[PDB]
C-alpha cells in the first residue's frame, strides 16, 4: 500500500558525483497505479535544511508536523526510480497542500507547464 | 553553460542498479528544464530501451529507428527516470522532435500523477 505522498526511508547509495546518495527520506512521486502494481517506485530525495534559500525546485517541510530529525527540504531536481525493495520503514506522509507545492516544483524541474 | 538541452538523447551508464531498475549503458532522453541543464551539475533523464513487443503502455513512448539513428525501434520509459551527474553522459546520439517531446511530456505527467 505504497502511496504517492508517502515518505519512506530508502538507501540511495551507491551514487556518483553530485547525485544524492545515502540512506535518507524520500517522497513517493509516482502515480498510485504504478505504486500499486509495479516493481518500482519514483521518488524525490529529502535532505536536511542547510540554509534559507529560494530554489524553485525545492520544497521545505517542517520537522514537527511530519516527524523529522530536522527541518528538511525536498529536492525535486533529485529524483529516481527505485526498486521497491529499497524502501525501508515508512516515516510519514505529506499533506495535500504540501503535495501541491511538490507537484509545482516537479513541473518546474521537468520543464512542464499547465 | 553546457550545450545540454531538454529532449537530447545521450548515451549514459546507468549501472549499477538494483532489481527492476534499468541499468547498463543505454540511450536516455534529457527531461530536465534547460536552466538546470545549463547551470546544474546534474540532469534528469528517462531511460530508453529496445522495443520487445508492441504494447500500449501509457508511460511508454515509441521512437522509430530511422528518424533517430538507432540500432533498433525503441521505447522511452517514463516510469524509469533518474537524476544523473553530467559526467555520466557519454556521446550525444540525437534529439527528439517537438511532437515526440509532447508525447513524452504527456507520458511523464501520467507517470508522476500530474494533471
Author numbering:
A (entry chain A): 1 to 114
B (entry chain B): -1 to 113
What's in the article?
TA modules are small operons encoding two proteins: a ‘toxin’ that interferes with basic cellular metabolism, usually translation or transcription, and an ‘antitoxin’ that neutralizes the toxin and protects the cell from its potentially destructive activity (for reviews see 1–4). The toxin MazF is activated under a number of stressful conditions via proteolytic degradation of its neutralizing antitoxin MazE by the ClpPA or Lon proteases, (18,30,35) and was proposed to be under control of quorum sensing. In this paper, we present a method to obtain large quantities of active SaMazF and provide the structure of this protein as determined by nuclear magnetic resonance (NMR) and X-ray crystallography. The SaMazF dimer is formed by pairing strand S6 from two monomers to form a dimer-wide 10-strand anti-parallel β-sheet.
Three different crystal forms of SaMazF are available, which lead to the structures of 14 crystallographically independent SaMazF monomers forming 7 independent dimers. Each of these monomers was independently refined except for the eight monomers present in crystal form III, which were restrained by NCS because of the lower resolution (excluding two more variable loops that clearly adopt distinct conformations). Overall, the structures of the SaMazF monomers are very similar with pair-wise backbone root-mean-square deviations (RMSDs) of 0.18–0.58 Å for all 99 residues defined in each molecule (the 8 NCS restrained monomers from crystal form III are represented in this comparison by chain A only). Loop S4-S5 (Ile61-Lys70) is involved in lattice contacts in most but not all SaMazF monomers. Four classes of conformations are observed. The most common conformation is observed in ten chains, two cases of which do not involve lattice contacts. In the remaining four chains, this conformation is prohibited as it would lead to steric clashes with a neighboring monomer. Of these remaining chains, form II chains A and B adopt the same conformation while form III chains D and E each adopt a unique conformation. Loops S4-S5 of the latter four chains are all involved in lattice contacts. Thus, it seems like loop S4-S5 will adopt a default conformation when the crystal environment allows for it, but will adapt its conformation otherwise.
